[model samples]
Target: INPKELLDRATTLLEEGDIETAAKVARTAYEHIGENGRHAGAALTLLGQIHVELGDIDAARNYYAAAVKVDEDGSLPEELGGGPEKFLWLAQLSEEGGHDSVAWFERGATVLRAQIQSLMDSLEQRPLSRGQVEAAIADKRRRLAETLCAVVEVYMTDLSWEDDAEQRCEALITEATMIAPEWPETWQTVANVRISQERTEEAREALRRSLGLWTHLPPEDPGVPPFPSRVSLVRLLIEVDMEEEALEVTERLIAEDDLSVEVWYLGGYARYRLGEKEREASG
Candidate 1:
């Protein structure tokens, strides 16, 4: 009957790798709470994440959609477990090649911006030390910047058909850089924009700039983007004709997790491309 406690128990079970039980428990909370309850959105969101972990993409999408519907973007703060995340999740889980994902990210980004605004005011109003205020703002700034990059990515692909896609991408990347210059994904998105624009050298330089931000650090670095970002970057390195650098990145990934199929395929391409160069020299 207590959805919150049920969700917490389910979350712990999930972390313990007991996915079946975790999912069952979370679903129970979702069905029991229904809509209009205080924890209904929480139940739905947890179910969404659980389904995603279970490789049930369509089921995950359904839960996230319902979660967003119940939560209502901008209606609540993130600390309340009802905010922009479900919309962002939908964006990630949506049709990547269509406007559907862009709309979802756009919705999330607006709420994220408002969240940042509210926090900025909170820093001024709340009795917090200077360092805590800086830390508090950093988290939201990172998310909003990353979200901007997501929208830019959609524009770089299928959304490219939009009349203003190029200009829109330029503006979003600029804002992201200004907001979170230290974030490597901000620079990588710059490279992506340049790549889509057919500016090869600029893209290469931007990719290198992004690499320098974290390649020298430990994989556990807090500033690093998640695992998928690094794998995607190897593909970018290959596109920019930096096979040597791409191969090096693949090694970093291998040490982190040997199970990533994309990293293996990307590593293979980088090696093949590098071998081709040697053959050209020999012939």
Candidate 2:
């Protein structure tokens, strides 16, 4: 079988729930590719799944870590952009392993607390490092922020509109803000987390901070790859129903050729919001 076609078939099989066949093809792909960026990434992730199906916890963690390292190093295929999943899976496994029926919730909570503490320790030591260490530090911070958001997302389902999610998101925003203050879009992400928890004031404050940081970038400054930071910030404001601000920012972004999908989408949402609010007022 052609290695490439087999690769496609393997993914199809995996999606079709044919784990055994999928695993066979994936192993062949691994053998042929032999630890190249994409190979290492896809192989480790799929291997983790196969091992989990076989009830092999240690093996699964090993694969997941390898995948995390690949993505963290920027050596992995772009398809695996969401490489934090490996770390997330490991965290879930760590928590589940401690959750026995006898001890129930406390055992799980203990493990989770330990994991969180371990993450915090890594964050603490990162600042003094040098060289390419900056990228590693950024990777760790991004992953940990993602982890914090994951935990907060799970917790928020059971939490009130005014509760710990705001605290949790604020903690992430503060940490990210300190770690990558010049990265305006990171603050936009923080703003979103606040909005998710319905902390309107905090979200607005975070957005203002994002705007401040973006203003520092030159009009032609790429800021980060793929898109300009201001474009993302404007789109996010529109998404959070800050329409007037979104429109004003969109005009600036358009002037800079930074028009985004959300520019038009924001205008539509703005109209929708106005109509709904007006209807409610009449009612």
Top TM-score: which candidate number?
1
Candidate 2 lDDT over residue span 55-149, tens digit each? 77887878776666666543333244323355557656654432121122222233334444554666667656544554554565555544443
Which candidate number has the best lDDT? Answer: 1
Q: Model 2: how large is the Cα RMSD against the reference? A: 11.2
lDDT of 2: 0.59
lDDT per residue, candidate 1, 1-283, as tens digits?
Answer: 4557888899899999999999999888767776766677777878888988899999999988888776775476453455777888999998554688888888888887887787788778877476787786788788888789988877877676766999999999889989988888888899988988899999998899999988888866676767889887887889999999998898888888968787888899899999999999969
How good is model 1 by TM-score? 0.82
Q: Model 1: how far is 95 from its true place, Å? A: 4.1
TM-score of each: 0.82, 0.44
Estimate every model's Cα lDDT from 0 to 1: 0.83, 0.59
